[PDB]
Design a protein around this ligand. Structure first.
Ligand SMILES: [Zn+2]
Ligand SMILES: [Zn+2]
Ligand SMILES: [Zn+2]
Ligand SMILES: [Zn+2]
Length: 111
DNA sequence: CTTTGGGGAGGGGTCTTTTAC
DNA sequence: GGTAAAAGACCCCTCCCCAAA
């Protein structure tokens, strides 16, 4: 949509350019009034408030288990299916999180 | 020794909803 | 009444870090 005036990086998000250039300041305008811990963006503050309020919006269809994070629900699925989701296309190894697969590719030669 | 698994964080994208023109 | 930009809601990703395999 538009280009960053500082880092000259293009953002495809509509209206997300102000969000990007606000990170260069380093400010944390959003503050948790309970724990006095400040975050970078409003949505990050909102998910942090789930810790204090105890809300568990993510539900398992069959288990009924409630989790505060989407990935926690995804990990719970692995106790039902027993399937490790991420797979390396060359070394034929499996991983339980996406960054673990990325770490394997960068750090090791896979083979 | 290296590798794995998870917590917490920041950073971008898409869809929708509000808001300022 | 209409339009476009920003904010929200939620999604995804990787990185730093470190007990635990
Ligand atoms: Zn920038
Ligand atoms: Zn808090
Ligand atoms: Zn379940
Ligand atoms: Zn591999």
């Amino acid at each position: 949509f538009q280009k960053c005036p500082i880092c000259e990086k293009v953002i495809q998000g509509a209206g997300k350019l102000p969000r990007h250039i606000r990170t260069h300041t380093g400010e944390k305008p959003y503050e948790c009034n309970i724990c006095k811990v400040r975050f970078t963006r409003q949505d990050k503050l909102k998910v942090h408030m789930r810790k204090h309020t105890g809300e568990k919006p993510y539900l398992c269809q069959q288990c009924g288990a409630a989790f505060a994070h989407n990935y926690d629900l995804k990990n719970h699925m692995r106790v039902h299916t027993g399937l490790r989701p991420y797979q390396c296309d060359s070394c034929c190894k499996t991983f339980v999180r996406s960054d673990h697969l990325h770490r394997h590719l960068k750090k090791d030669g896979c083979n």
